[PDB]
Design a protein around this ligand. Structure first.
Ligand SMILES: *[C@](O)(C(=O)NC1CC1)[C@H](CCC)NC(=O)[C@@H]1[C@H]2CCC[C@H]2CN1C(=O)[C@@H](NC(=O)[C@@H](NC(=O)c1cnccn1)C1CCCCC1)C(C)(C)C
Ligand SMILES: *[C@](O)(C(=O)NC1CC1)[C@H](CCC)NC(=O)[C@@H]1[C@H]2CCC[C@H]2CN1C(=O)[C@@H](NC(=O)[C@@H](NC(=O)c1cnccn1)C1CCCCC1)C(C)(C)C
Lengths: 305, 305
């Protein structure tokens, strides 16, 4: 037992990190097969950032303007192309340490592991949720751009995130591995608000199931609720609406604990309307919303990779 | 910016995990060079656990009673010995993936990364603190014994923890890699209380510095305090005494923020005596004590490995 914010083992990703330099900008790239992926703003000067024409700027670059290093090994760039906001550098060597992988685009409320890197070297690993406003609450310093987020599925690393920038609120934004930003953002140095952040209701419910599985049960009650009446209360507290698809994904946890999803919703309703009265759940005084139902199942059932 | 519970990259450890079977008990081992390390209670029957004589039980075992597997590779055990509560199996193959390493014994309040494994396969990675009562608040299911905790120092994995057992309170206990338990525990199935848990004061102070570094500053005040007067308040709230050595280790953070250690102590004093009044620090409603001063510096300065 116990319940922790747990990341995927990062070994299969550490072997893909390289350092990409263009001009005086050094950041991280992802070296899969014979392509290195990195944020396209590696080609910009700080003056270019206010309003860059990336098409024009990349045309003025040549292959030898890109210095890619895998440790000490100097990779020779033989081609460069732009896919949305990511740059694809073709190199003369396939990365042997290339795992089985796919590129996936996660949905708001889904979680992933971030391998934070600097100068192509891993610094640490942590777990993040894609917020409903398509930011992430990461931990990133200058030099971290090109760090990636990922899940492991059996043997196959699904890459879902590449880090590009930080908002004035301290939260972070980036793309999927085809180069499309999550959220409304563009890679230009202008004011760009993220939406209202909301609480990921299905994840709070998942974590309440995790608490029950670990013997923390004081919040269970005799009350029940319809899904609609739950959402009327939840939306007042800036919680995301709970859908029937969400109810379905909570099914395994409902089955394992014997507590119907709408019964647990009635627990959450009372916690929202009455607070926790100075009590804690799984050691927290606030409700936690960065565990998905699948996260709870994997951690409470011991899935390996 | 941002601040996360961050673990070390786990790649150099994933290559050391193997599966050890003896009788009907399967758990994890650590394969370094030509020695596999695992908990000695792998040799016990469930009936042996109430009061085992490990010396007698191991004498009745032979090398071929130990089935060690590195994936599909069958390792041949050529020797077995017991060091305190860990079993050392000599094998006929040195592990190539063996990193530079040492065995270290951490002190209460220090943190480490746990690579949770089942059947010799990594399941996930998370960060833990050694509690002042020498338990850890981990996440471990049946089959996780032999999972290890570690820090990375430049290039050298310092192994500090091997998982052995879970207490009735849901917290966990284990040994260092020379086989000595942390805390008062013995590997026998009897009632064994952990002491009072206390709050790791130097770590709370570290995390308050991390909050200031991230622009969360509402808790700063004009008050100051002597170290002794701080400890008089802190001990009333079951906080560990803050020592002059602790003050020294907070020095870098004091220097970088310009806030004297005793000035920050006066902030902590008021938070303890007045609560947070429904405010949060770094998104938490409770004070966090599982980041060391070095953790905060590494994460806020971007140290890599
Ligand atoms: C990353 O490229 C890297 O690691 N580079 C290595 C060191 C050489 C770098 C890391 C940030 C710490 N990212 C960036 O430099 C990005 C790029 C891509 C988008 C614009 C530039 C600057 N940038 C940033 O992350 C900045 N953030 C912003 O500029 C925000 N701007 C504003 O909020 C704003 C407000 N009023 C007026 C004008 N701008 C972002 C920009 C994009 C939309 C969301 C808001 C800094 C300040 C460096 C964090
Ligand atoms: C680990 O060996 C493993 O992963 N094995 C693989 C599946 C085959 C296994 C994992 C636990 C979930 N650990 C154990 O089996 C250890 C060993 C070593 C010490 C005794 C045995 C049993 N054990 C446990 O972790 C148990 N915990 C306890 O027995 C507590 N006992 C009591 O609290 C207690 C209370 N009243 C009377 C008698 N005992 C521990 C025992 C040691 C001191 C602290 C308290 C379980 C119940 C399996 C968690």
């Amino acid at each position: 037992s116990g319940f922790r914010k747990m990341a995927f083992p990062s070994g299969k990703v550490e072997g893909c990190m390289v350092q990409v330099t263009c001009g005086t900008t050094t950041l991280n790239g992802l070296w899969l097969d014979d392509v290195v992926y990195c944020p396209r703003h590696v080609i910009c000067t700080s003056e270019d950032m206010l309003n860059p024409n990336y098409e024009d700027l990349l045309i003025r670059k040549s292959n030898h303007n890109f210095l890619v290093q895998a440790g000490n090994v100097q990779l020779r760039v033989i081609g460069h192309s732009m896919q949305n906001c990511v740059l694809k550098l073709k190199v003369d060597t396939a990365n042997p340490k290339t795992p089985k992988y796919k590129f996936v685009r996660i949905q708001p409320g889904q979680t992933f592991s971030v391998l934070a890197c600097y100068n192509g070297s891993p610094s640490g690993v942590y777990q993040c949720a894609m917020r409903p406003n398509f930011t992430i609450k990461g931990s990133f310093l200058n030099g971290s751009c090109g760090s990636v987020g990922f899940n492991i599925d059996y043997d196959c690393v699904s890459f879902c995130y590449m880090h590009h920038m930080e908002l004035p609120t301290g939260v972070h934004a980036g793309t999927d591995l085809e180069g499309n930003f999550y959220g409304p953002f563009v890679d230009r140095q202008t004011a760009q608000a993220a939406g209202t952040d909301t609480t990921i209701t299905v994840n709070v419910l998942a974590w309440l199931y995790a608490a029950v599985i670990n013997g923390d049960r004081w919040f269970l009650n005799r009350f029940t609720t319809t899904l609609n009446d739950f959402n009327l209360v939840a939306m007042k507290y800036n919680y995301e609406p709970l859908t029937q698809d969400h109810v379905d994904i909570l099914g395994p946890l409902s089955a394992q604990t014997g507590i119907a999803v709408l019964d647990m919703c009635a627990s959450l309703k009372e916690l929202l309307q009455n607070g926790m009265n100075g009590r804690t759940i799984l050691g927290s005084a606030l409700l936690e919303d960065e565990f998905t139902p699948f996260d709870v199942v994997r951690q409470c059932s011991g899935v390996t990779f």
